[PDB]
Amino acid sequence: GISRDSRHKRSATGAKRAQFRKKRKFELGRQPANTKIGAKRIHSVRTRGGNKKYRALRIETGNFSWASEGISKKTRIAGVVYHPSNNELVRTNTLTKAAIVQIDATPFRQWFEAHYGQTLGKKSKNAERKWAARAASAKIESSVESQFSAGRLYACISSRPGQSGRCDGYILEGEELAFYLRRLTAK
Amino acid sequence: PRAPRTYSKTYSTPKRPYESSRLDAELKLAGEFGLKNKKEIYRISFQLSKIRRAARDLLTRD
Amino acid sequence: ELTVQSERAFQKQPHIFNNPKVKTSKRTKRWYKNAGLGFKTPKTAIEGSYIDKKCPFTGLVSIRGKILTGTVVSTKMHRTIVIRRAYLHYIPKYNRYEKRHKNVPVHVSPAFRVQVGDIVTVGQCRPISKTVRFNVVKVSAA
Amino acid sequence: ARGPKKHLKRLAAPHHWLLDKLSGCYAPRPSAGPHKLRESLPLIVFLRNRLKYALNGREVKAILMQRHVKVDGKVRTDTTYPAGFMDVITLDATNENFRLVYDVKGRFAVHRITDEEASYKLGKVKKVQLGKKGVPYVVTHDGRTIRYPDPNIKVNDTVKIDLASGKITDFIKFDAGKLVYVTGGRNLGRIGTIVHKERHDGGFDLVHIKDSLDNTFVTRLNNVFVIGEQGKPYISLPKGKGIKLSIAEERDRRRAQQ
RNA sequence: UAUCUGGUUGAUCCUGCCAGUAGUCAUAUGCUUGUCUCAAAGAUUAAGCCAUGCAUGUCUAAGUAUAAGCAAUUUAUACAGUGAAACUGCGAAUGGCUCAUUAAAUCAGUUAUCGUUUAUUUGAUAGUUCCUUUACUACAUGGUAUAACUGUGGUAAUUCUAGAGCUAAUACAUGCUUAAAAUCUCGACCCUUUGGAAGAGAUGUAUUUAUUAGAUAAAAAAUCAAUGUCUUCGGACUCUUUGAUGAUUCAUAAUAACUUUUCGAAUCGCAUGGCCUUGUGCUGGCGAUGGUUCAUUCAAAUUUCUGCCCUAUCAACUUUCGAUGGUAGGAUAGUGGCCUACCAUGGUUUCAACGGGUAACGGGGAAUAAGGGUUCGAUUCCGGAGAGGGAGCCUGAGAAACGGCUACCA
RNA sequence: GUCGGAUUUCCAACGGGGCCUUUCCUUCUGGCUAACCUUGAGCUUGGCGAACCAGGACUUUUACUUUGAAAAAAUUAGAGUGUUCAAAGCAGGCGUAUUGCUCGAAUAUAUUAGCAUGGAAUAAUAGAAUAGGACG
RNA sequence: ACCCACUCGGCACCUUACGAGAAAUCAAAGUCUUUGGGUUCUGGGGGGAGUAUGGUCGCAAGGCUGAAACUUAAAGGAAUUG
RNA sequence: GCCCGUCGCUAGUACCGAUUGAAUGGCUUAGUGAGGCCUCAGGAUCUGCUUAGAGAAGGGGGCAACUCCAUCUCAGAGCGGAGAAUUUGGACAAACUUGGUCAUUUAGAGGAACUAAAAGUCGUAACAAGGUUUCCGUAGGUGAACCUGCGGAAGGAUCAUU
RNA sequence: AUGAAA
């Protein structure tokens, strides 16, 4: 199996270490996950000490956070559009950490309507008081407003699905939002 | 596995073998004190040598 | 050191959510930590726009264990240097010494700007790389 | 070697059990417990090579299984259980109570005592933490884990416990001028009344300590064990009371007590 | 016990070697050998090959027994005594043998895990599991085999197994049953507009992500976006609370969700005790087993500083296709070129790198000595490696297992 | 001044701690306020922070050397012990031998390297000179 | 240009022997068992052998580095008397 | 007296050497590449649910056709669970073939040395001024020690010509 | 010019 030690590498001076041991189980590795989209399949693998490890594959839906509001909703995943590590992962549409993908934006949309009562894109006493109190905060910025107009919203995967069985992430906002749309539009 | 039994002799042969004075002295000792073995004589000399090294390296100190 | 976001990824401090909605004084936030053992977090590290998560002060790489002092001899690498530990190994038989050196490499933050000859002390942190384990905390030359 | 050790030879077993280098090439391995491997006295070597209440390990296991024996107010029917420091053992037969404490010669002593002095013990806190559900708690030097204690109890303190429950009778803080006991090093068994300490921030807090013959020394803060206040010990103490006289003075002592 | 002696000369003084002498847990051999005690013993060459026979199996009062096994319950109609075989649960990864590999590698002293796993023990620790949550559902408790066994048997042989008929569980797959408060949402309704609102769903534990708190060198002033506590609506404004660490995005708490759904006892032995609303009603002990988390303990894996024999008839080594670093990701139980994508060209060297040799495992130590030292250390103890050479992997907490499998080579 | 043990003023030496002689030998907040100028009649009410401590702070570098913590046993040296002596081993010894009593199983060594440590000779070691120099 | 006296650096000399060495001898070949001012290069009985091999330089002759197997009890230094 | 070399006999040790020499072990380019493991499919087989219409028994009801539900039966339909053989792609990579390279030994016609060995032949080079003073380096010559040329030294046979 | 071995 894939080793994880440095007894198989060269030393720092430029010296091939000798063959000293046989490979172990506490220096092993295993194959990548190559997690894809659609028809969720999760094989599990036994680890050191029981301690299960949900090897994600083919994951259709995942969790996504909006951090200024602290909320976290479930959504599908259109596909990855940018990955700093590899354009190969970009092409083959493989989810990993730090990965820039697009999501529906519709549960956030309808939740936004129910929570502030303020339109996007383009009655009862209690709900009216609620929206009137939460007003002066439906003024987020232009790029997210455009993305809610489009119905395809930029998120970053920040989980480790090959270690967790979870594509979890967060909507982009402000600074890194501008940075990543700059990287996409860079031509 | 059994912790090994210490063994150590209780005699020591002469450095220089054939000195007629030494040989006659230890023969004198064996034939007057009723001994069989220069081994035994060396043994007694070894005890004396042990205590003499101890005495020296103790009385060296203040 | 022209651009903090030089790399394709977005380098930042994890979990330090600078909220874009509120516009309060000091528009962007920065985590840090006192390393301990009587060291100082420099004002350049406080005011810095850089990230360098492998730094002991602003980053997340705890110093613990041995501490050493040496003079720098290489600077030609990216956020990494090599020092020289000139010392004298004793030989009992001849009852006298001999010069020896061990060129340990260490990691260096952007909080210090170091040219060759700058004497430096470090701290044992976790394995930064195949070659590196230590990280610098004070410099003692010009 | 591919897993936990299970056997233990003699000459890797510690010194202070005083196990003989003859009589079979294997030693009793302390099964896991509230104390370490080396600073622990198994009940097998206890009954078989301190009291001679039995002669063979079969007999000692017979005793432990028929339950004439009980530690900390519980039977503890294992032949190789760790009887560690400060600990209590109770024998219905003879109505005796032995205590496992140290002696100044660096050995596990045999402290004959009564039932209430068994019913309480002492335990140094090893650390303090906050458990789940916002429950502050502490943990001692004998694997005992205790909940909702006093905030005055901080690290290096000692607690005195009921032994019918895990609750507290009282506690003793760490500060300058308290009676102590040493556990680790050449000073094994000393009793030496803290005079001051020193930090060396980064590891190895050290403490300056002296016994009542004016004789001073320095010890590590994880090797010490505080037993109370000056004068009165909170328990009864073994022969010597931690003095470590010279070899010649002890020679004269026994030759006067021939 | 800081010792010398014989030998080049016709003789003498020297350098200089030879030989002598003493020792060795240093072996072999010869010749001889009466006794007591203690005891090394196929290491050196061949880690060369092995016939045969043993070396790990295992149960209590207490996981499963209709043995068509054996005594007898007669205190027991279901057994309730003992008990092969078999299912189950543990262990077989310790021990034992050798020293082949290996020259910054093992190892020795000395550090760290604020960078991780940890069965077993030991101390604490699961009022919150009815999911159109009102009939959707037994909780004095639910379903399915399958072994053993019965018999049919098939191969020359195998700890070979098929076919058919049963039956068990701490085996599998499932599964409800106990408080009180406290905030969010809705939100009936009054409608008030200072705005008041009945009633309903959530909250245990665990995983994953995001956020906040997790603290505190020193004292006063000007207002309000809208008074916020209660009002003399002149404003008195106090009250405030957070542990440890050398030091943390620590321990820990709370918001918002995720889970194909983790754990929250359908287990077992003794003794049988009390309340009467006189019901197999309600309550009750001493235990064993298992179980989520935390801590402990036996460990484990990486890791800081220093140290190794001979070689320059080895002076440059490493980097194609990882060598040195950085960023991101995968993998890991975890850091980290451990591996991949992109980028910078580095890293080691006469203070002997790199390559070669070694009748080289390292050490605690052994022989031997005034001092300095030299030689040896396979070998009882500590840590490593291996099971004929290599590679791979299941079960498991723990193996790259070999008295376990798979292939190739001999 | 005990009948060869131990004491005082001890003259002197021997090494140690402190003050001054141009000799700051880091000081700001503090509580101890300390040594308290604080004194009540001869034992009273109020001095300058390290002598205890948390910190802000400059802490220019080593080599050296002292002391300490720590270095698994066995081995080595070495205490006691009649295994019949001895090699050994860690046992044994004493009773009214019926209840039993009881000292032991010491101590030493532990290289280099690592941690703390008092010192400041020795050996190097940078300092403020077309003063970006310190107290301010 | 000579003479006298002094001086520093040289090539050396005559005599002693406090000192050294095995001795011849030596102003260092002294200040070394009363063993240490700093550093470099070389030797470890005689031969085999400055051979064989491997690099390296040279047109060549040859040079620099440079062993082993094997053999032997002496070879060698300085002096004394013949 | 002592001694040198060639030549001759006996025995040994090592070197050069045709043989694209031979072996042993390690590293390894290239090619083939088992075997498991991971992932894309595969689907025998077994098995739970939902209906699903009828050949027609049984009883309950117009008691006569007819009607209600269970029933031995079989398609047919989906809703699923487990699921071996086989299989794509990947990484780990044994083993074999071919080269290269590094070390450790080894065969060999013959050639040229060295050493040892009681009495072999040819001369007499050296030690005295050794009978041409010896030796050092270099070159040529010749059976052999050796001679000669050019320079150098005293270890010379001279420490010496006012 | 040479002069056998102990």
UniProtKB/Swiss-Prot annotation, chain A:
Keywords: Cytoplasm, Phosphoprotein, Ribonucleoprotein, Ribosomal protein
Entry GO MF terms: structural constituent of ribosome
Positions bearing Phosphoserine: S65, S68, S72, S85, S142, S143, S146, S149
InterPro entries: Ribosomal_eS8, Ribosomal_eS8_CS, Ribosomal_protein_eS8_euk, Ribosomal_Se8/biogenesis_NSA2
Phosphothreonine: residues carrying this PTM: T61, T106
TM stretches of this protein: none
Ranges where the record places region Disordered: 1-30
Quaternary structure annotation from Swiss-Prot or TrEMBL: Component of the small ribosomal subunit (SSU). Mature yeast ribosomes consist of a small (40S) and a large (60S) subunit. The 40S small subunit contains 1 molecule of ribosomal RNA (18S rRNA) and 33 different proteins (encoded by 57 genes). The large 60S subunit contains 3 rRNA molecules (25S, 5.8S and 5S rRNA) and 46 different proteins (encoded by 81 genes).
Family annotation (PANTHER family): 40S RIBOSOMAL PROTEIN S8 (PTHR10394)
Similarity comment: family membership: Belongs to the eukaryotic ribosomal protein eS8 family.
Described purpose of this protein according to its UniProt entry: Component of the ribosome, a large ribonucleoprotein complex responsible for the synthesis of proteins in the cell. The small ribosomal subunit (SSU) binds messenger RNAs (mRNAs) and translates the encoded message by selecting cognate aminoacyl-transfer RNA (tRNA) molecules. The large subunit (LSU) contains the ribosomal catalytic site termed the peptidyl transferase center (PTC), which catalyzes the formation of peptide bonds, thereby polymerizing the amino acids delivered by tRNAs into a polypeptide chain.
Name assigned to this protein: Small ribosomal subunit protein eS8A
UniProtKB/Swiss-Prot annotation, chain B:
Name assigned to this protein: Small ribosomal subunit protein uS4A
Lineage, broadest ranks: Eukaryota, Fungi, Dikarya, Ascomycota, Saccharomycotina
Job description of the protein: Component of the ribosome, a large ribonucleoprotein complex responsible for the synthesis of proteins in the cell. The small ribosomal subunit (SSU) binds messenger RNAs (mRNAs) and translates the encoded message by selecting cognate aminoacyl-transfer RNA (tRNA) molecules. The large subunit (LSU) contains the ribosomal catalytic site termed the peptidyl transferase center (PTC), which catalyzes the formation of peptide bonds, thereby polymerizing the amino acids delivered by tRNAs into a polypeptide chain.
Organism per entry: Saccharomyces cerevisiae (strain ATCC 204508 / S288c) (Baker's yeast)
Additional information: Present with 106000 molecules/cell in log phase SD medium. There are 2 genes for uS4 in yeast.
The family this protein is said to belong to: Belongs to the universal ribosomal protein uS4 family.
Gene that encodes the chain: RPS9A
Shown part of the complete sequence: 2 to 63 of 197
Record's subcellular location: Cytoplasm; Nucleus, Nucleolus
Swiss-Prot record, chain C:
GO cellular component terms given for this protein: 90S preribosome; cytosol; cytosolic small ribosomal subunit
Molecular-function GO term, any one: rRNA binding
InterPro entries in UniProt: NA-bd_OB-fold (IPR012340), Ribosomal_uS17 (IPR000266), Ribosomal_uS17_arc/euk (IPR028333), Ribosomal_uS17_CS (IPR019979), Ribosomal_uS17_N (IPR032440)
Subcellular location: Cytoplasm
Glycyl lysine isopeptide (Lys-Gly) (interchain with G-Cter in ubiquitin) cross-link site: K12, K43, K53, K54, K76, K93, K102, K130, K138
PROSITE patterns from the UniProt entry: RIBOSOMAL_S17
Gene Ontology BP term (one): ribosomal small subunit assembly
PTM comment, free text: N-terminally acetylated by acetyltransferase NatA.
Family: Belongs to the universal ribosomal protein uS17 family.
Task performed by this protein: Component of the ribosome, a large ribonucleoprotein complex responsible for the synthesis of proteins in the cell. The small ribosomal subunit (SSU) binds messenger RNAs (mRNAs) and translates the encoded message by selecting cognate aminoacyl-transfer RNA (tRNA) molecules. The large subunit (LSU) contains the ribosomal catalytic site termed the peptidyl transferase center (PTC), which catalyzes the formation of peptide bonds, thereby polymerizing the amino acids delivered by tRNAs into a polypeptide chain.
NCBIfam families: PRK08572.1, uS17_arch
Protein name listed in UniProt: Small ribosomal subunit protein uS17A
Organism: Saccharomyces cerevisiae (strain ATCC 204508 / S288c) (Baker's yeast)
Curated annotation (Swiss-Prot), chain D:
Start and end residues of each S4 RNA-binding domain: 41-104
Position of the signal peptide: none
Pfam families: 40S_S4_C (PF16121), KOW (PF00467), Ribosomal_S4e (PF00900), RS4NT (PF08071), S4 (PF01479)
Transmembrane segments: none
GO biological process, one term: translation
Tagged with keyword DNA repair: no
GO MF annotation terms: RNA binding; rRNA binding; structural constituent of ribosome
Residue runs in coiled coils: none
A cellular-component GO term for this protein: cytosol
Modified residues (Phosphoserine): S31, S246
InterPro entries per the UniProt record, alphabetical: KOW, Rib_uL2_dom2, Ribosomal_eS4, Ribosomal_eS4_C, Ribosomal_eS4_central_region, Ribosomal_eS4_central_sf, Ribosomal_eS4_KOW, Ribosomal_eS4_N
Gene3D superfamilies according to UniProt: 2.30.30.30, 2.40.50.740, RNA-binding S4 domain
Cross-link (Glycyl lysine isopeptide (Lys-Gly) (interchain with G-Cter in ubiquitin)): K61, K133, K160, K167, K173, K178, K210, K232
Sites of Phosphothreonine modification: T114
Keywords, in A-Z order: Cytoplasm, Isopeptide bond, Phosphoprotein, Ribonucleoprotein, Ribosomal protein, RNA-binding, rRNA-binding, Ubl conjugation
Subunit composition and interactions: Component of the small ribosomal subunit (SSU). Mature yeast ribosomes consist of a small (40S) and a large (60S) subunit. The 40S small subunit contains 1 molecule of ribosomal RNA (18S rRNA) and 33 different proteins (encoded by 57 genes). The large 60S subunit contains 3 rRNA molecules (25S, 5.8S and 5S rRNA) and 46 different proteins (encoded by 81 genes).
Family: Belongs to the eukaryotic ribosomal protein eS4 family.
Annotated protein name in UniProt: Small ribosomal subunit protein eS4A
Organism, as annotated: Saccharomyces cerevisiae (strain ATCC 204508 / S288c)
